[PDB]
Structure 1
Amino acid sequence: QASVSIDAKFKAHGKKYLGTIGDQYTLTKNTKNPAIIKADFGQLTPENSMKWDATEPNRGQFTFSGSDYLVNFAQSNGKLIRGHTLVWHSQLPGWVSSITDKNTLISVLKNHITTVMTRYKGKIYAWDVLNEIFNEDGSLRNSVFYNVIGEDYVRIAFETARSVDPNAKLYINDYNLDSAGYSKVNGMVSHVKKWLAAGIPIDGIGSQTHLGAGAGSAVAGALNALASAGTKEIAITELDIAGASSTDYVNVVNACLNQAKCVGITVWGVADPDSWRSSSSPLLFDGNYNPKAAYNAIANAL
């Protein structure tokens, strides 16, 4: 645990949280990891336990052991929770992607959203309802949901989520929304404006922010562009930067800090060894679960 909590310092500026991710393994693999989580971060996203493959491996049969644990740990230690993720083309069981009948897929979609959301009703701050539904050019990704249901699955998913747990912030999450003017950013903005105009309950836009070295400085403009979609809020949801330089990290923190709509930042992991991009050492803590320079830089920037 770092003496100074960047979450505490971020919240001091009116932000909701500066959090990270977890699940049974990382929360129990050693003493430092969970201790770092409770001391320096104020929100948790299950790294894998809430995905479709992990929650509904077979049609109508749910497995909630991993997610229950993550939720219970967060709830027991005062951490906000971002559910992740309800509708996604990846980590999706084959039984879903093989469905060809529109009404059957809609029924399955709704039951999955309903069951997973109902179990944690009232405990989730935000839900990444939809994940990565855009192609890089801004057009809709041809996943099973898009191909079988058509664009209406967007309305269906959000409306179902809204009715199931009206207390949660409903989000659409995606990566590569990292610089203003980028085709995917333009596509995210125009689509959300349209959906919001049609009455679709989209509360926020989540920008993953999986960056390479030196890309931190363009994030501020990206957030500014995303703010034009018209959602109540936006958030950096899965932040990690190859090289984890202070300049990049502080640039990204400032990007959120200076944009009214950005409610928080979630770093995709605590320490480098547990990163899904470990070879690039993209996190705030190192192989010894000790604060890296960027962590301190962030703290001194707040």
Structure 2
Amino acid sequence: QASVSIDAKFKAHGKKYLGTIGDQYTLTKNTKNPAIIKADFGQLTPENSMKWDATEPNRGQFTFSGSDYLVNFAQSNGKLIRGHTLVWHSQLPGWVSSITDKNTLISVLKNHITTVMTRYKGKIYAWDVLNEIFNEDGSLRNSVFYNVIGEDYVRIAFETARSVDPNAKLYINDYNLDSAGYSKVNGMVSHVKKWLAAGIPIDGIGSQTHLGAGAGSAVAGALNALASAGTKEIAITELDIAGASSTDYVNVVNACLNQAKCVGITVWGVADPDSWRSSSSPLLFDGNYNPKAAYNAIANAL
């Protein structure tokens, strides 16, 4: 645990949180990891336990052991929770992707959303209802949901989420929304504008922000461009930067800090060894679970 909590300093600027991720393994693999989460971060996103493959492995048969643990740990330690993720083409069981009947897929989609959200009703700050539904050019990704149901799946997912838990902020999450003018950014903005005008309950846009070295400075503009979609809020949901330079990290923190709609930042992991991009040392804590330079840089910028 770093003596200075970046979550605390971020919150002092009016932001809701500066969080990270977790699940049973990383929360128990050693003493430093859970200790860092409790001391320096104010929000948690389950790294894998709430995804479709881990929650409904067989049609109508749910497995909530992992998700229960993450939710319980967060709730037991005053950490906000971002549910992740309800509808996604990746980490999706074969039984779902093989469905070809529209009404059958809609029923399945609604039952999944309903069961997962009802189990944690009122405990979730934000749900990534839809994840990565756009192609790089801004068009809609041809996942089984898009192919079988069509564009109406967007409305169905959000409306169902809204009715099941009206207390949760409903998000559409995606990666590569990292610089203004990028095709995917333009596609995210125009579609959301349309969906909001049609009455679809989309509360926020989540920008994963998985960056390469030097890409930090373009994030501010990307967030400004996303703010034009018209959602109530936006958030950096899965931050990690190859090389973890202070310049990059401070640039990203300031990007959110200086944009009114940005409610928080979630770093995709605590320490480098546990990163899904470990070879690039993209996180705030090192192999010894000690604060890296970027962590201190972030603290001193706040």
Normalised TM-score (structure 1): 1.00
- 1:248-267 residue pairs with structure 2 within 5 A? 248-267=248-267
Runs of 4+ in 1 over 3 A off after TM superposition: none
Alpha-carbon deviations, 1:95-141, whole Å to 9, x = none?
00000000000000000000000000000000000000000000000
Alpha-carbon deviations, 1:196-219, whole Å to 9, x = none?
000000000000000000000000
Distance across 1 between alignment mates of 2:118 and 2:180:
37
SS in 2 for 1:177: coil
Distance across 2 between alignment mates of 1:27 and 1:130:
26
Partner of 1:115: 115
Distance across 2 between alignment mates of 1:24 and 1:245:
29
Partner of 1:73: 73
Alpha-carbon deviations, 1:39-82, whole Å to 9, x = none?
00000000000000000000000000000000000000000000
Alpha-carbon deviations, 1:6-41, whole Å to 9, x = none?
000000000000000000000000000000000000
Cα shift at 1:164? 0.1
Cα shift at 1:168? 0.0
Cα shift at 1:250? 0.1
- Return 5+ residue gaps in structure 1 as ranges: none
Distance across 2 between alignment mates of 1:165 and 1:48:
21
Cα shift at 1:92? 0.1
Normalised TM-score (structure 2): 1.00
Cα shift at 1:273? 0.2
Distance across 2 between alignment mates of 1:159 and 1:146:
17
Cα shift at 1:170? 0.1
SS in 1 for 2:265: strand
Distance across 1 between alignment mates of 2:64 and 2:283:
28
Cα shift at 1:182? 0.1
Partner of 2:152: 152
Cα shift at 1:153? 0.0
Distance across 1 between alignment mates of 2:38 and 2:193:
37
Cα shift at 1:171? 0.1
Cα shift at 1:260? 0.2
- Return 5+ residue gaps in structure 2 as ranges: none
SS in 2 for 1:266: strand
Distance across 2 between alignment mates of 1:39 and 1:245:
22
Cα shift at 1:276? 0.1
Alpha-carbon deviations, 1:254-289, whole Å to 9, x = none?
000000000000000000000000000000000000
Identity across the alignment (%): 100
Distance across 2 between alignment mates of 1:281 and 1:55:
30
Distance across 1 between alignment mates of 2:199 and 2:50:
27
Alpha-carbon deviations, 1:182-207, whole Å to 9, x = none?
00000000000000000000000000
Cα shift at 1:150? 0.1
Cα shift at 1:230? 0.1
Q: In the comparison of the two structures, how many residue pairs are matched?
A: 302
Partner of 1:291: 291
**Cα root mean square deviation, aligned:** 0.1
SS in 1 for 2:85: strand
